[PDB]
Design a protein around this motif. Structure first.
Motif, PDB file in Angstrom:
ATOM      1  N   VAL A 164      87.567  58.866   4.495  1.00 18.47           N
ATOM      2  CA  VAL A 164      86.225  59.458   4.391  1.00 18.47           C
ATOM      3  C   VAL A 164      85.325  58.494   3.641  1.00 18.47           C
ATOM      4  O   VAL A 164      85.609  58.142   2.488  1.00 18.47           O
ATOM      5  N   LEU A 165      84.206  58.138   4.263  1.00 20.04           N
ATOM      6  CA  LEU A 165      83.193  57.297   3.648  1.00 20.04           C
ATOM      7  C   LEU A 165      81.996  58.173   3.308  1.00 20.04           C
ATOM      8  O   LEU A 165      81.342  58.719   4.190  1.00 20.04           O
ATOM      9  N   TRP A 190      68.406  46.294   2.737  1.00 22.07           N
ATOM     10  CA  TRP A 190      69.207  47.450   3.166  1.00 22.07           C
ATOM     11  C   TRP A 190      70.118  47.124   4.355  1.00 22.07           C
ATOM     12  O   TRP A 190      71.308  47.476   4.288  1.00 22.07           O
ATOM     13  N   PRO A 191      69.673  46.499   5.452  1.00 21.50           N
ATOM     14  CA  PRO A 191      70.621  46.186   6.537  1.00 21.50           C
ATOM     15  C   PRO A 191      71.787  45.320   6.082  1.00 21.50           C
ATOM     16  O   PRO A 191      72.911  45.509   6.569  1.00 21.50           O
ATOM     17  N   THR A 192      71.545  44.359   5.187  1.00 20.63           N
ATOM     18  CA  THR A 192      72.627  43.513   4.693  1.00 20.63           C
ATOM     19  C   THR A 192      73.618  44.341   3.900  1.00 20.63           C
ATOM     20  O   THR A 192      74.834  44.168   4.024  1.00 20.63           O
ATOM     21  N   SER A 193      73.113  45.277   3.109  1.00 22.41           N
ATOM     22  CA  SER A 193      73.973  46.175   2.354  1.00 22.41           C
ATOM     23  C   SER A 193      74.795  47.087   3.259  1.00 22.41           C
ATOM     24  O   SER A 193      76.007  47.300   3.037  1.00 22.41           O
ATOM     25  N   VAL A 194      74.185  47.595   4.328  1.00 23.56           N
ATOM     26  CA  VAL A 194      74.918  48.375   5.307  1.00 23.56           C
ATOM     27  C   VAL A 194      75.976  47.553   6.009  1.00 23.56           C
ATOM     28  O   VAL A 194      77.091  48.050   6.241  1.00 23.56           O
ATOM     29  N   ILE A 197      78.997  47.470   3.884  1.00 26.58           N
ATOM     30  CA  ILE A 197      79.761  48.701   3.998  1.00 26.58           C
ATOM     31  C   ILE A 197      80.612  48.679   5.258  1.00 26.58           C
ATOM     32  O   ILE A 197      81.800  49.012   5.218  1.00 26.58           O
ATOM     33  N   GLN A 198      80.017  48.326   6.395  1.00 20.37           N
ATOM     34  CA  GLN A 198      80.742  48.292   7.665  1.00 20.37           C
ATOM     35  C   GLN A 198      81.934  47.332   7.584  1.00 20.37           C
ATOM     36  O   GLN A 198      83.018  47.643   8.088  1.00 20.37           O
ATOM     37  N   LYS A 199      81.745  46.175   6.937  1.00 19.74           N
ATOM     38  CA  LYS A 199      82.824  45.211   6.825  1.00 19.74           C
ATOM     39  C   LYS A 199      83.909  45.664   5.894  1.00 19.74           C
ATOM     40  O   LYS A 199      85.067  45.365   6.126  1.00 19.74           O
ATOM     41  N   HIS A 200      83.564  46.379   4.842  1.00 19.30           N
ATOM     42  CA  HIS A 200      84.557  46.788   3.846  1.00 19.30           C
ATOM     43  C   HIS A 200      85.339  48.024   4.270  1.00 19.30           C
ATOM     44  O   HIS A 200      86.508  48.140   3.864  1.00 19.30           O
ATOM     45  N   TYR A 201      84.753  48.917   5.085  1.00 19.91           N
ATOM     46  CA  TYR A 201      85.373  50.184   5.449  1.00 19.91           C
ATOM     47  C   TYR A 201      85.439  50.381   6.960  1.00 19.91           C
ATOM     48  O   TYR A 201      84.967  51.385   7.500  1.00 19.91           O
ATOM     49  N   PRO A 202      86.058  49.450   7.684  1.00 22.24           N
ATOM     50  CA  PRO A 202      86.064  49.534   9.151  1.00 22.24           C
ATOM     51  C   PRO A 202      86.901  50.659   9.689  1.00 22.24           C
ATOM     52  O   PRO A 202      86.787  50.993  10.879  1.00 22.24           O
ATOM     53  N   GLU A 203      87.744  51.266   8.886  1.00 23.13           N
ATOM     54  CA  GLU A 203      88.621  52.330   9.361  1.00 23.13           C
ATOM     55  C   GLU A 203      88.119  53.692   8.939  1.00 23.13           C
ATOM     56  O   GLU A 203      88.813  54.701   9.117  1.00 23.13           O
ATOM     57  N   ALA A 204      86.882  53.791   8.466  1.00 23.80           N
ATOM     58  CA  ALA A 204      86.323  55.074   8.123  1.00 23.80           C
ATOM     59  C   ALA A 204      86.336  55.958   9.365  1.00 23.80           C
ATOM     60  O   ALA A 204      85.950  55.547  10.460  1.00 23.80           O
ATOM     61  N   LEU A 219      76.820  56.301  12.067  1.00 22.64           N
ATOM     62  CA  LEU A 219      75.782  56.537  11.092  1.00 22.64           C
ATOM     63  C   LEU A 219      75.346  55.229  10.453  1.00 22.64           C
ATOM     64  O   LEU A 219      74.202  55.079  10.068  1.00 22.64           O
ATOM     65  N   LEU A 220      76.264  54.285  10.255  1.00 25.91           N
ATOM     66  CA  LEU A 220      75.906  53.036   9.608  1.00 25.91           C
ATOM     67  C   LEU A 220      74.942  52.210  10.465  1.00 25.91           C
ATOM     68  O   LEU A 220      73.906  51.788   9.978  1.00 25.91           O
ATOM     69  N   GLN A 221      75.275  51.999  11.725  1.00 25.54           N
ATOM     70  CA  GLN A 221      74.385  51.258  12.584  1.00 25.54           C
ATOM     71  C   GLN A 221      73.047  51.971  12.745  1.00 25.54           C
ATOM     72  O   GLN A 221      71.999  51.350  12.761  1.00 25.54           O
TER      73      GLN A 221
END
Ligand SMILES: C[C@@H](c1cccc2c(-c3ccc(CS(C)(=O)=O)c(F)c3)c(C(=O)O)[nH]c12)N1C[C@H](CN2CC(N)C2)OC1=O
Ligand SMILES: [Zn+2]
Ligand SMILES: [Zn+2]
Length: 232
Positions: A164-165, A190-194, A197-204, A219-221
Motif C-alpha cells: 500500500v502506497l 512535482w513531476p520529478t518527485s512523483v 515515488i514511481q521508481k522507489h515503489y514499483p510494486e505498489a 494515480l501517480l502518472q
C-alpha cells in the motif's frame, strides 16, 4: 455500504474508516475551508496490538471523532501518529491526539512550517528524511521523502506487508482536474518527485491520495499529468 466514502455519505461531524488491506485502513472526514467542503484521507496501520496513525482528520473535532471511530471499529489503541506535511488537513487535531496519549511525529521541516503558520505542532522530529530519496522505517511502515511536490515537506508512506502506497497530498485521485490547493506547491519539481515515488515503489498495489478515491499505480502518472497542465 462498502463503497469508498465521500462527503455525501459521512454524517455531519463524523469520520468513516475503509478497509484497504489486512491491517490497513484509510480514514475519511470532511471539512470546510474558505466556504467550500472537502474530503480528506489518512491512514491507520496495525502495529502488533497497537495502531499507527498517518495524518489527522482535519480539525480537532474531526480528530476526536476519528479516535472514537477507531475504538468502535478496531478497538486497538493508537500509540503514535505521523503527519505527512504541515497543513491543517495533516496536523489539525495533533493537540487532541497529544491529549489522548498519542505520541505525534513529523519531519523537522514540517514542524518548522507548522509553527511558522500557526498550525498545531507534532511533538517529535523525524530525522533521516531531509534529502530527496531518503527513507526510514517507522513501525510497520516506511516513510519516504520524494522531494518538493504539493509542499516542500511532503512525505509518502509505504506499507510493505500489503504493498500500500499512501501518497498524501503529493498524489491526486484519478478524477482530479487540477492539482488541488497549490498555494505551497513546487509545480516544476512535482513531476520529478512523483517519478522518484514511481521508481522507489514499483510494486505498489493500492495508491491512496491525500483527498479522494484510492486506486492503483495510475494515480501517480495522472498526478504528474494534472500538475504539468496546471503549471502550463
Ligand atoms: C488545508 C489545505 C487545503 C484546503 C482546502 C482544499 C485543499 C486541497 C484540495 C484537494 C483536492 C481538490 C479537488 S481537485 C484535486 O482540484 O480536483 C481541491 F480542490 C482542493 C488540498 C490539496 O490539494 O492537498 N489541500 C487543501 N491547504 C491550505 C493551504 C493554504 N496555504 C496555507 C498558507 N501557507 C496558504 O494550502 C493547502 O493545501
Ligand atoms: Zn496540503
Ligand atoms: Zn491536502
Amino acid at each position: 455500504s462498502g463503497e469508498y466514502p465521500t462527503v455525501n455519505e459521512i454524517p455531519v461531524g463524523e469520520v468513516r474508516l475503509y478497509q484497504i488491506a489486512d491491517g490497513v485502513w484509510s480514514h475519511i472526514a470532511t471539512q470546510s475551508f474558505d466556504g467550500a467542503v472537502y474530503p480528506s484521507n489518512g491512514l491507520i496501520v496495525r502495529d502488533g496490538d497497537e495502531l499507527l496513525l498517518i495524518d489527522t482528520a482535519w480539525g480537532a473535532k474531526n480528530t476526536a471523532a476519528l479516535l472514537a471511530e477507531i475504538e468502535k471499529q478496531i478497538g486497538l489503541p493508537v500509540t503514535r501518529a505521523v503527519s505527512t506535511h504541515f497543513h491543517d488537513d495533516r496536523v489539525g487535531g495533533v493537540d487532541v491526539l497529544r491529549a489522548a496519549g498519542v505520541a505525534t511525529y513529523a519531519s523537522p521541516s514540517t514542524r518548522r512550517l507548522a509553527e511558522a503558520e500557526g498550525n498545531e505542532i507534532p511533538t517529535h522530529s523525524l530525522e533521516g528524511l531531509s534529502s530527496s530519496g531518503d527513507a526510514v522505517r517507522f513501525g510497520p511502515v516506511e516513510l519516504f521523502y520524494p522531494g518538493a511536490a504539493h509542499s516542500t515537506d511532503n512525505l509518502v508512506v509505504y506499507v510493505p506487508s500489503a504493498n500500500v502506497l499512501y501518497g498524501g497530498c503529493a498524489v491526486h485521485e484519478l478524477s482530479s482536474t487540477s492539482a488541488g490547493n497549490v498555494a505551497d506547491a513546487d509545480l516544476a519539481e512535482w513531476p520529478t518527485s512523483v517519478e522518484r515515488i514511481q521508481k522507489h515503489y514499483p510494486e505498489a498495489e493500492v495508491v491512496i491520495p491525500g483527498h479522494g478515491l484510492p486506486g492503483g499505480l495510475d494515480l501517480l502518472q495522472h498526478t504528474a499529468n494534472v500538475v504539468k497542465a496546471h503549471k502550463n
